[PDB]
Design a protein around this ligand. Sequence first.
Ligand SMILES: CN[C@@H](C)C(=O)N[C@H](C(=O)N1CCC[C@H]1c1nc(-c2cccc3ccccc23)cs1)C1CCCCC1
Ligand SMILES: [Zn+2]
Length: 90
Amino acid sequence: GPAFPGMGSEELRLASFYDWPLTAEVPPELLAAAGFFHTGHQDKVRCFFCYGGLQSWKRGDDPWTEHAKWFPGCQFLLRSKGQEYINNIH
Ligand SMILES: CN[C@@H](C)C(=O)N[C@H](C(=O)N1CCC[C@H]1c1nc(-c2cccc3ccccc23)cs1)C1CCCCC1
Ligand SMILES: [Zn+2]
């Protein structure tokens, strides 16, 4: 199951980005959709399912792409995007 079941709701994840410092650069909507919640410190986020953390986001970074790049074994990623998507990023 998920590492952090309490953040399984996309809406709750989205709410966590109220203080996100990079709204124009990396949309909270896309981050939340990709399983990420905001830790509250800087631009650090974490996936609710695999608990993978990502920081130092660059403008135009795609949350789903980054999820697959760094945490290809995440089952939420797999269920959401499929194996073909993950394979093509590598
Ligand atoms: C350019 N696009 C971004 C999204 C990206 O690729 N970030 C990578 C990343 O966050 N990584 C690479 C794998 C692990 C993770 C990291 N995670 C942390 C980290 C350390 C300590 C506490 C943390 C808390 C929350 C999230 C990440 C944390 C540091 S680096 C990495 C950042 C540093 C420079 C190389 C790339
Ligand atoms: Zn994940």
